Amino acid sequence: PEQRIEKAKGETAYLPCKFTLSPEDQGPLDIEWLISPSDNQIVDQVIILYSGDKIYDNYYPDLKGRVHFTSNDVKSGDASINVTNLQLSDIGTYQCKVKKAPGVANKKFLLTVLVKPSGTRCFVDGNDFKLKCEPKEGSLPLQFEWQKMPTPWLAEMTSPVISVKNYSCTVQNRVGSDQCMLRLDV
């Protein structure tokens, strides 16, 4: 299958693509990395290309300055790349295409970018109150834990909404945490 790579935001993805040439393989060496945004199967885009023994980072303006061949000597049999400063737009399918006539190889990489929860707002709206711990950005499944010892709220301790009628909010997933504070008055 297509190797599955899961990373956090703002960092660098390492995609391995090492190759061994065979004696037949005498044509011009040529490498071409393609990104497939949201995996739409009608179109891919070139991010980085190797040709005439000259590199090109010339395209996909979104990735301008953010993608590089790890290796020094790519011809030596190493086409691996690094993707730097990972964002949510970088999600997609990544493909490694090596061609040296008549030989040819291909590797599929399925990239996934999760977000450590941060930027949560804590706000209030014998009344019909609602206390709220609304995060963004983040990613599910999220967990919430509110503190201070309120008895009729104890059940809501975990839900992100304290629908109140008649001090913290800790927010956690499996890639990061977060802390937020609120005030109320009756």
XYZ file of N, CA and C in Angstrom:
558
model
N 0.782 -1.241 0.000
C 0.000 0.000 0.000
C 0.811 1.288 0.000
N 0.097 2.395 0.162
C 0.711 3.726 0.198
C 1.063 4.058 1.639
N 2.350 4.122 1.946
C 2.761 4.390 3.327
C 2.007 5.577 3.911
N 1.531 5.378 5.140
C 0.748 6.380 5.868
C 1.627 7.116 6.857
N 1.753 8.421 6.651
C 2.536 9.285 7.546
C 1.683 10.315 8.262
N 1.688 10.215 9.589
C 0.949 11.131 10.471
C 1.889 12.071 11.216
N 1.664 13.363 11.015
C 2.485 14.402 11.634
C 1.665 15.498 12.299
N 2.347 16.260 13.144
C 1.756 17.439 13.783
C 1.998 18.661 12.924
N 1.305 19.726 13.287
C 1.395 20.990 12.569
C 2.780 21.575 12.732
N 3.099 22.479 11.815
C 4.243 23.378 11.924
C 5.612 22.746 11.819
N 5.654 21.444 11.584
C 6.923 20.708 11.546
C 7.224 20.077 10.183
N 8.162 19.132 10.156
C 8.747 18.660 8.889
C 8.540 17.180 8.645
N 7.996 16.863 7.464
C 7.666 15.482 7.115
C 8.823 14.936 6.322
N 9.262 13.730 6.705
C 10.315 12.960 5.994
C 9.778 11.782 5.184
N 9.891 11.913 3.863
C 9.348 10.916 2.953
C 10.517 10.224 2.260
N 10.792 8.960 2.626
C 11.879 8.154 2.042
C 11.608 7.567 0.668
N 12.567 7.792 -0.215
C 12.497 7.279 -1.582
C 13.891 6.976 -2.114
N 14.417 5.862 -1.631
C 15.744 5.388 -2.006
C 15.668 4.329 -3.102
N 16.574 4.464 -4.065
C 16.575 3.597 -5.240
C 17.950 3.072 -5.623
N 17.923 1.893 -6.233
C 19.109 1.216 -6.734
C 18.974 1.001 -8.223
N 19.849 1.647 -8.978
C 19.827 1.528 -10.441
C 20.343 0.179 -10.899
N 19.792 -0.287 -12.010
C 20.253 -1.512 -12.640
C 21.064 -1.181 -13.894
N 21.965 -2.085 -14.288
C 22.893 -1.854 -15.389
C 22.226 -1.361 -16.677
N 21.008 -1.809 -16.930
C 20.281 -1.413 -18.140
C 20.057 0.083 -18.106
N 19.870 0.574 -16.890
C 19.264 1.877 -16.657
C 20.251 2.969 -17.003
N 20.201 3.374 -18.263
C 21.232 4.227 -18.835
C 20.729 5.603 -19.241
N 19.415 5.765 -19.323
C 18.815 7.031 -19.750
C 19.054 8.194 -18.797
N 18.520 9.369 -19.133
C 18.715 10.462 -18.194
C 17.988 10.181 -16.899
N 18.671 10.405 -15.783
C 18.032 10.320 -14.471
C 17.072 11.468 -14.334
N 15.920 11.158 -13.756
C 14.871 12.146 -13.616
C 13.906 11.839 -12.495
N 13.817 12.762 -11.549
C 12.932 12.612 -10.404
C 11.881 13.694 -10.373
N 10.687 13.295 -9.959
C 9.546 14.198 -9.954
C 8.585 13.865 -8.821
N 8.495 14.763 -7.847
C 7.540 14.615 -6.739
C 6.237 15.314 -7.063
N 5.140 14.594 -6.847
C 3.808 15.135 -7.071
C 2.960 15.137 -5.815
N 2.297 16.266 -5.588
C 1.284 16.380 -4.525
C -0.097 16.267 -5.121
N -0.946 15.542 -4.399
C -2.326 15.318 -4.802
C -3.267 15.847 -3.719
N -3.562 17.156 -3.768
C -4.382 17.794 -2.742
C -5.715 17.105 -2.554
N -6.037 16.849 -1.287
C -7.261 16.163 -0.885
C -7.483 14.904 -1.719
N -6.408 14.467 -2.361
C -6.359 13.209 -3.096
C -7.200 13.137 -4.356
N -7.760 14.261 -4.805
C -8.589 14.242 -6.031
C -7.828 13.562 -7.166
N -8.502 12.603 -7.777
C -7.832 11.634 -8.632
C -7.803 12.086 -10.081
N -8.144 13.345 -10.311
C -8.114 13.889 -11.665
C -6.816 14.641 -11.912
N -6.235 15.183 -10.847
C -5.054 16.032 -10.995
C -4.071 15.926 -9.855
N -2.801 15.900 -10.232
C -1.691 16.048 -9.294
C -0.878 17.276 -9.684
N -0.066 17.753 -8.751
C 0.839 18.867 -9.035
C 2.265 18.555 -8.676
N 3.163 19.060 -9.507
C 4.588 18.911 -9.257
C 5.001 19.908 -8.194
N 5.708 19.400 -7.198
C 6.255 20.247 -6.158
C 7.758 20.415 -6.402
N 8.476 19.302 -6.457
C 9.906 19.333 -6.767
C 10.286 18.340 -7.868
N 11.262 18.762 -8.662
C 11.727 18.038 -9.840
C 13.256 18.061 -9.936
N 13.811 16.956 -10.418
C 15.254 16.814 -10.611
C 15.528 16.443 -12.063
N 16.280 17.298 -12.751
C 16.532 17.138 -14.192
C 17.672 17.985 -14.743
N 18.434 17.367 -15.640
C 19.629 17.982 -16.216
C 20.615 18.169 -15.087
N 20.451 17.311 -14.089
C 21.184 17.398 -12.835
C 21.100 18.808 -12.278
N 19.884 19.337 -12.294
C 19.553 20.593 -11.631
C 18.190 20.480 -10.971
N 18.134 20.932 -9.727
C 16.906 20.888 -8.928
C 15.968 22.029 -9.290
N 14.680 21.784 -9.091
C 13.665 22.813 -9.275
C 12.638 22.799 -8.158
N 12.556 23.935 -7.482
C 11.587 24.177 -6.406
C 10.600 25.218 -6.915
N 10.602 25.353 -8.233
C 10.066 26.513 -8.959
C 8.541 26.648 -8.916
N 7.854 25.591 -8.491
C 6.379 25.547 -8.572
C 5.661 25.177 -7.278
N 4.334 25.201 -7.371
C 3.442 25.075 -6.221
C 3.770 26.183 -5.220
N 3.381 27.425 -5.548
C 3.692 28.616 -4.767
C 3.378 28.467 -3.286
N 2.474 27.554 -2.965
C 2.130 27.296 -1.567
C 3.347 26.721 -0.846
N 4.123 25.923 -1.563
C 5.249 25.203 -0.969
C 6.568 25.910 -1.231
N 6.480 27.134 -1.729
C 7.678 27.926 -2.020
C 8.566 28.028 -0.794
N 9.693 27.335 -0.853
C 10.718 27.454 0.176
C 10.535 26.459 1.300
N 9.558 25.574 1.148
C 9.205 24.648 2.223
C 9.489 23.162 1.948
N 9.943 22.828 0.741
C 10.265 21.427 0.411
C 11.663 21.227 -0.191
N 12.376 20.219 0.311
C 13.770 19.951 -0.117
C 14.163 18.460 -0.106
N 14.974 18.057 -1.084
C 15.611 16.716 -1.067
C 16.526 16.640 0.135
N 16.315 15.636 0.975
C 17.146 15.460 2.158
C 18.577 15.264 1.740
N 18.784 14.229 0.956
C 20.114 13.865 0.457
C 20.886 15.003 -0.171
N 22.194 14.799 -0.145
C 23.148 15.638 -0.845
C 23.215 15.119 -2.286
N 23.659 13.874 -2.408
C 23.873 13.244 -3.711
C 22.704 12.365 -4.103
N 21.720 12.995 -4.717
C 20.444 12.325 -5.011
C 20.644 11.166 -5.996
N 21.577 11.344 -6.922
C 21.850 10.338 -7.954
C 22.376 9.062 -7.332
N 23.067 9.206 -6.214
C 23.709 8.065 -5.570
C 22.681 7.001 -5.245
N 21.414 7.308 -5.504
C 20.324 6.381 -5.207
C 19.402 6.848 -4.090
N 19.306 8.161 -3.918
C 18.437 8.722 -2.886
C 17.636 9.933 -3.312
N 16.321 9.735 -3.326
C 15.383 10.728 -3.811
C 14.505 11.271 -2.691
N 14.790 10.858 -1.461
C 13.964 11.263 -0.314
C 13.879 12.771 -0.190
N 12.763 13.223 0.366
C 12.551 14.643 0.609
C 12.066 14.955 2.010
N 12.284 16.204 2.381
C 11.677 16.824 3.569
C 10.673 17.903 3.193
N 9.549 17.911 3.909
C 8.499 18.940 3.785
C 8.473 19.715 5.084
N 8.767 21.013 4.992
C 8.967 21.843 6.169
C 7.789 22.742 6.487
N 7.670 23.024 7.780
C 6.615 23.869 8.328
C 5.242 23.374 7.886
N 4.877 22.204 8.389
C 3.649 21.522 7.959
C 2.387 22.270 8.377
N 1.489 22.423 7.407
C 0.166 23.021 7.604
C -0.930 22.104 7.081
N -2.174 22.500 7.309
C -3.324 21.655 6.988
C -3.560 21.571 5.496
N -3.025 22.539 4.762
C -3.182 22.581 3.302
C -2.240 21.590 2.621
N -1.314 21.059 3.403
C -0.286 20.168 2.873
C -0.790 18.744 2.899
N -2.025 18.594 3.367
C -2.662 17.291 3.404
C -2.887 16.834 1.972
N -2.640 15.559 1.744
C -2.785 15.010 0.428
C -2.029 13.726 0.248
N -1.800 13.403 -1.014
C -1.095 12.198 -1.387
C 0.149 12.565 -2.150
N 1.242 11.982 -1.687
C 2.576 12.330 -2.142
C 3.188 11.143 -2.843
N 3.713 11.424 -4.025
C 4.176 10.389 -4.921
C 5.592 10.649 -5.395
N 6.396 9.592 -5.380
C 7.792 9.657 -5.810
C 8.051 8.880 -7.113
N 8.365 9.631 -8.169
C 8.564 9.097 -9.507
C 9.995 9.207 -10.015
N 10.661 8.056 -10.075
C 12.029 7.939 -10.582
C 12.070 7.293 -11.971
N 12.735 7.964 -12.905
C 12.866 7.461 -14.276
C 14.289 7.558 -14.816
N 14.815 6.406 -15.192
C 16.091 6.351 -15.866
C 16.064 5.247 -16.910
N 15.707 5.649 -18.119
C 15.371 4.711 -19.175
C 16.307 3.496 -19.171
N 15.723 2.285 -19.207
C 14.293 2.031 -19.336
C 13.614 1.835 -17.999
N 14.390 1.922 -16.934
C 13.880 1.632 -15.591
C 12.956 2.704 -15.053
N 12.008 2.277 -14.234
C 11.067 3.207 -13.615
C 10.494 2.703 -12.316
N 10.388 3.592 -11.345
C 9.792 3.236 -10.050
C 8.883 4.316 -9.477
N 8.068 3.860 -8.539
C 6.973 4.644 -7.971
C 6.662 4.265 -6.526
N 6.467 5.302 -5.714
C 6.120 5.157 -4.306
C 5.027 6.133 -3.914
N 4.022 5.619 -3.222
C 2.914 6.447 -2.754
C 2.993 6.685 -1.275
N 2.807 7.950 -0.919
C 2.799 8.379 0.473
C 1.537 9.144 0.812
N 0.826 8.662 1.827
C -0.407 9.295 2.288
C -0.136 10.133 3.514
N -0.162 11.443 3.314
C 0.209 12.390 4.362
C -0.992 12.905 5.128
N -0.809 12.949 6.441
C -1.838 13.384 7.382
C -1.278 14.396 8.363
N -1.979 15.519 8.482
C -1.555 16.620 9.348
C -2.586 16.954 10.419
N -2.278 16.533 11.640
C -3.104 16.833 12.812
C -2.669 18.126 13.484
N -3.581 18.672 14.274
C -3.368 19.963 14.928
C -3.526 19.882 16.439
N -2.451 20.227 17.138
C -2.477 20.298 18.603
C -3.447 21.393 19.041
N -4.403 21.039 19.921
C -5.485 21.943 20.275
C -4.966 23.173 20.974
N -5.309 24.314 20.398
C -4.938 25.605 20.952
C -5.808 26.709 20.366
N -6.103 27.692 21.204
C -6.907 28.838 20.803
C -8.359 28.629 21.163
N -8.583 28.220 22.403
C -9.933 27.968 22.888
C -10.467 29.172 23.643
N -11.675 29.570 23.278
C -12.368 30.654 23.964
C -13.253 30.089 25.054
N -13.165 30.715 26.225
C -14.074 30.461 27.348
C -15.015 31.636 27.513
N -16.297 31.390 27.291
C -17.277 32.460 27.427
C -18.637 32.014 27.945
N -19.267 32.948 28.650
C -20.662 32.839 29.064
C -21.532 33.558 28.050
N -22.794 33.154 27.991
C -23.754 33.775 27.070
C -24.597 34.882 27.723
N -31.749 33.479 38.192
C -32.362 32.189 37.888
C -32.587 32.026 36.402
N -31.562 32.385 35.634
C -31.640 32.412 34.170
C -31.375 31.046 33.528
N -31.101 31.084 32.227
C -30.983 29.900 31.375
C -29.565 29.829 30.776
N -28.569 29.983 31.645
C -27.151 30.140 31.234
C -26.558 28.972 30.455
N -25.474 29.292 29.761
C -24.611 28.298 29.115
C -23.148 28.726 29.173
N -22.337 27.904 29.836
C -20.884 28.088 29.862
C -20.228 27.241 28.776
N -19.215 27.824 28.151
C -18.729 27.337 26.872
C -17.206 27.382 26.784
N -16.648 26.283 26.284
C -15.206 26.143 26.048
C -14.984 25.728 24.602
N -14.956 26.721 23.723
C -14.939 26.484 22.276
C -13.529 26.602 21.702
N -12.971 25.486 21.215
C -11.610 25.503 20.700
C -11.513 25.730 19.213
N -10.413 26.359 18.823
C -9.967 26.387 17.422
C -8.586 27.044 17.281
N -7.643 26.360 16.631
C -7.889 25.064 15.988
C -7.663 23.907 16.939
N -8.162 22.760 16.509
C -7.936 21.481 17.192
C -8.276 20.294 16.312
N -8.417 19.132 16.939
C -8.893 17.934 16.238
C -9.332 16.820 17.176
N -10.338 16.086 16.702
C -11.070 15.110 17.511
C -10.384 13.751 17.515
N -10.692 12.908 18.514
C -11.610 13.164 19.617
C -10.980 14.006 20.722
N -11.613 15.148 20.977
C -11.191 16.082 22.029
C -11.762 15.697 23.373
N -10.987 15.982 24.414
C -11.438 15.824 25.800
C -11.384 17.152 26.556
N -12.381 17.358 27.414
C -12.471 18.564 28.252
C -12.612 18.196 29.717
N -11.967 18.982 30.567
C -12.110 18.849 32.019
C -12.130 20.207 32.716
N -13.287 20.551 33.272
C -13.483 21.842 33.941
C -13.265 21.669 35.437
N -12.754 22.716 36.087
C -12.486 22.699 37.545
C -12.709 24.051 38.258
N -12.234 24.114 39.502
C -12.253 25.337 40.311
C -11.061 25.395 41.260
N -16.315 23.491 42.973
C -16.705 22.117 43.255
C -18.208 21.924 43.011
N -18.742 22.495 41.911
C -20.195 22.607 41.720
C -20.902 21.274 41.503
N -21.866 21.007 42.374
C -22.557 19.713 42.408
C -23.444 19.421 41.193
N -24.290 20.383 40.774
C -25.179 20.081 39.651
C -24.492 20.290 38.310
N -23.204 20.616 38.373
C -22.360 20.744 37.182
C -21.404 19.563 37.035
N -21.249 18.801 38.110
C -20.254 17.720 38.159
C -20.374 16.779 36.972
N -21.598 16.612 36.492
C -21.875 15.731 35.359
C -21.344 16.323 34.060
N -21.292 17.650 34.015
C -20.887 18.386 32.814
C -19.394 18.596 32.788
N -18.752 18.243 33.890
C -17.303 18.403 34.041
C -16.522 18.098 32.777
N -17.075 17.216 31.955
C -16.351 16.650 30.823
C -16.823 17.161 29.482
N -18.102 17.495 29.424
C -18.701 18.069 28.224
C -18.236 19.523 28.057
N -18.131 19.998 26.809
C -17.580 21.319 26.535
C -18.575 22.428 26.793
N -19.789 22.042 27.159
C -20.832 23.016 27.477
C -21.496 22.738 28.818
N -21.499 23.767 29.647
C -22.197 23.737 30.922
C -23.500 24.509 30.805
N -24.518 23.839 30.276
C -25.848 24.434 30.164
C -26.451 24.617 31.551
N -26.209 25.798 32.105
C -26.620 26.165 33.466
C -28.050 26.706 33.493
N -28.794 26.328 34.525
C -30.204 26.734 34.661
C -30.608 27.026 36.100
N -31.327 28.134 36.278
C -31.864 28.517 37.585
C -30.759 28.802 38.596
N -9.863 27.846 38.669
C -10.927 27.730 37.675
C -10.372 27.529 36.260
N -10.771 26.422 35.636
C -10.168 25.971 34.375
C -11.130 25.446 33.312
N -10.507 25.140 32.181
C -11.051 24.241 31.160
C -9.912 23.659 30.346
N -9.443 22.488 30.760
C -8.318 21.815 30.088
C -8.772 21.009 28.877
N -8.102 21.246 27.755
C -8.481 20.651 26.475
C -7.386 19.799 25.888
N -7.743 18.555 25.620
C -6.767 17.540 25.254
C -7.206 16.593 24.138
N -6.278 16.367 23.218
C -6.375 15.265 22.257
C -5.119 14.409 22.377
N -4.803 13.651 21.337
C -3.659 12.744 21.393
C -2.453 13.328 20.680
N -2.383 14.652 20.646
C -1.221 15.346 20.072
C -0.875 16.661 20.781
N -1.636 17.001 21.817
C -1.466 18.286 22.497
C -2.525 18.628 23.523
N -2.209 19.644 24.322
C -3.093 20.129 25.392
C -3.245 21.653 25.396
N -4.041 22.143 26.343
C -4.458 23.553 26.373
C -5.225 23.909 27.655
N -5.073 25.161 28.084
C -5.692 25.680 29.321
C -6.357 27.047 29.151
N -7.556 27.164 29.717
C -8.412 28.343 29.526
C -9.219 28.698 30.775
N -9.497 29.983 30.949
C -10.170 30.458 32.165
C -11.344 31.391 31.871
N -12.381 31.266 32.696
C -13.637 32.006 32.508
C -14.173 32.551 33.820
N -14.965 33.613 33.711
C -15.698 34.171 34.856
C -17.188 34.397 34.586
N -17.965 34.169 35.636
C -19.435 34.237 35.611
C -19.945 35.084 36.773
N -21.100 35.708 36.585
C -21.719 36.447 37.686
C -23.243 36.513 37.674
N -23.795 36.258 38.855
C -25.240 36.199 39.082
C -25.706 37.316 40.014
